[PDB]
């Protein structure tokens, strides 16, 4: 609002039989300037939950140190009882609504996901506090562009294997490379399964510029 | 912030203005009479912006007066009302919005008496009784309570004195005298001014 904040663009994710996969590009765009290339926007927390960020990255470093400190703090009480991704979603919701309630708001708009004891989870937490659950999410312009490819396949079959979901978000991330202006080539794809959180970065997009030479 | 009132009788229509020419803080000479004499049987009234009342409605008086003393007969008040609605409505949005709101008392011979009404946007409507200004907001229910559709002349005059004594009592502006004219099938008459 006051300055050209350092942003990202999109953390798009989909759940699948198994776990949930979220993906984001590593980009530190300083207002139409890719000032920071190798910049991870995918936070790992305790072994059954993940976390992204789309908006301001400085507020995401604030959230990675308060989420990190909170989850190690309640992690070292022993007695089992780690955070289900219920509680990271709800705590992040109350943190942001209690943050805009004093008009000093966090500006990033993330999606947290994770595989709980029974089934997976993919929840959206907005800049304003608009929080919900969905079978497939996308943030920023991905919510305009990756979101149709996600809620087309999932209206046909709401059941995905891991390779179908992984190729699905790779293809959607290629679409955001094609259309979104604040988007960069390489991206981290990141999946939480029964065996836990793992982050496979960075990847690339096989570009298709074969329609270019038909312009006159 | 002035005050215009009219009541349509069965064979007449009477209008009354407030006889106060205002200023920033003070009032000027009272009389300044707002009711502009039309041809013989039409009579319009004008308040609003101080400087468009004496300008626009006198120009309408020029054109209707030219119509009568150009082609013999005069206008019916319907054609005069739609005439000045046309002229204000097309002088509205162009370059200089004439901010006046008109009453137009009148009668034709072979139809009834008519009291036309329009805002400063020149939206015209017939009315059995109409009002204007801020004083319209409190006095109009007394013409709701007592106005029969058929009313004699002196009953309408003392009803009009009820409206002016209420307007004298509650409304915050000093409006002590009111100019009253009954027009009917013998031409424009003028009732004695109501003072306090």
């Amino acid at each position: 609002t006051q300055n050209p904040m350092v942003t990202g663009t999109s953390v798009l994710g989909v759940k699948f039989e198994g776990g949930v996969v979220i993906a984001a590009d590593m980009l530190g765009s300083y207002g139409s300037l890719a000032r920071f290339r190798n910049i991870s926007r995918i936070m790992r927390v305790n072994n059954s939950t993940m976390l992204g960020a789309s908006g301001d990255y400085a507020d995401f470093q604030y959230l990675k140190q308060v989420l990190g400190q909170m989850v190690i703090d309640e992690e070292l009480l022993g007695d089992g009882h780690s955070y289900s991704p219920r509680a990271i979603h709800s705590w992040l919701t109350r943190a942001m609504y209690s943050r805009r309630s004093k008009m000093n708001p966090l500006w990033n708009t993330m999606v947290i996901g994770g595989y709980a004891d029974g089934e997976s989870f993919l929840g959206y937490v907005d800049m304003l506090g608009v929080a919900y659950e969905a079978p497939s999410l996308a943030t920023g312009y991905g919510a305009y562009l990756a979101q149709p490819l996600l809620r087309e396949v999932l209206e046909k079959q709401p059941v995905l294997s891991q390779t179908e979901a992984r190729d699905l978000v790779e293809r959607c991330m290629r679409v955001l490379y094609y259309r979104d202006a604040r988007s960069y080539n390489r991206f981290q794809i990141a999946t939480v399964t029964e065996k836990g959180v793992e982050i496979e970065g960075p990847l690339s997009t096989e570009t298709n510029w074969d329609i270019a030479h038909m312009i006159s | 912030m002035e005050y215009l009132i009219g009541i349509q009788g069965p064979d007449y229509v009477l209008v009354a203005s407030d006889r106060v020419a205002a200023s920033n803080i003070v009032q000027m000479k009272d009389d300044h009479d707002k009711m502009f004499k039309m041809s013989e049987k039409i009579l319009l009234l004008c308040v609003g912006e101080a400087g468009d009342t004496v300008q626009f409605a006198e120009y309408i008086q020029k054109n209707v007066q030219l119509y009568k003393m150009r082609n013999g007969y005069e206008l019916s008040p319907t054609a005069a009302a739609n005439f000045t609605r046309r002229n204000l409505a097309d002088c509205l949005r162009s370059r200089t919005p004439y901010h006046v709101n008109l009453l137009l008392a009148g009668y034709d011979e072979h139809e009834g008496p008519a009291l036309y009404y329009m805002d400063y946007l020149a939206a015209l409507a017939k009315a059995p009784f109409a009002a204007h200004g801020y004083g319209a907001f409190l006095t109009l229910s007394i013409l709701d309570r007592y106005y029969t559709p058929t009313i004699s002349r002196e009953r309408a005059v003392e009803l009009l004195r009820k409206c002016l004594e209420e307007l004298q009592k509650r409304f915050i502006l000093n409006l002590p005298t009111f100019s009253v004219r009954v027009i009917d099938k013998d031409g424009i008459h003028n009732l004695e001014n109501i003072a306090f």
Binding site: - | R85, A89, L92, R93, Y117, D119, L121, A122, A123, L124, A125, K126, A127, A130, A136, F137, L140
Partner: protein, 204 residues
């Protein structure tokens, strides 16, 4: 706003070979009702009524302007006006004064003058033809007159059922509004009659 100045609310709906156009007889400033009789349903043909809403100086201005160009059109070429053509003519009356437009949304209700196939149309401020075979809605209290009259209208209705449903749609629509209502008016246009009627409403 400026559309909420004089209130006003017209609609039109058709079943069988009749249509039904309906207005609310009310005119005044935002809080004040300076009169009850106010012409909003302007006849143009024998069986083609145009109904207007919004700012009252624009509904009399393009009502009389449309009677000018319409009347001169049927004088230049002797026949009753085909109503699709009149839709095109108000479409090129509200437009071409696009900059500083007229603040009205005229609906057009009626019959083809030789085949008696009914239709009803609606336009926006700057003039866009919405041809409609169900019902059209104009005025301040739009979505009530939607909403409810989309919840009432069945297809292929004779004039007494259409009579009854536009009566209920108008009364319960404008009752749930502040700046509209206080006695409404319904014109039924059959292929032989104009059942013109008023309706005692919640006049408050």
């Amino acid at each position: 706003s400026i559309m909420s100045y004089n209130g006003g609310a017209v609609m039109a709906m058709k079943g069988k070979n009749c249509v039904a156009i309906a207005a609310d007889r009310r005119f005044g400033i935002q809080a004040q009702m300076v009169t009850t009789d106010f012409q909003k349903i302007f006849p143009m043909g024998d069986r083609l009524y145009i109904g207007l809403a919004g700012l009252a100086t624009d509904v009399q201005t393009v009502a009389q302007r449309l009677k000018f160009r319409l009347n001169l059109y049927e004088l230049k070429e002797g026949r009753q006006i085909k109503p699709y053509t009149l839709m095109s003519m108000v479409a090129n009356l509200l437009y071409e004064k696009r900059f500083g437009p007229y603040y009205t949304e005229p609906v057009i209700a009626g019959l083809d003058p030789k085949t008696f196939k009914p239709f009803i149309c609606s336009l926006d401020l700057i003039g866009c033809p919405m041809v409609t075979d169900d019902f059209v809605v104009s005025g301040t209290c739009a979505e009530q007159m939607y909403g409810m009259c989309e919840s009432l209208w069945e297809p292929n209705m004779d004039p007494d059922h259409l009579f009854e449903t536009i009566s209920q749609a108008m009364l319960n629509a404008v009752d749930r509004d502040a700046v509209s209502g206080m006695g409404v008016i319904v014109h039924i246009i059959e292929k032989d009659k104009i059942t013109t009627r008023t309706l005692k409403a919640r006049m408050d």
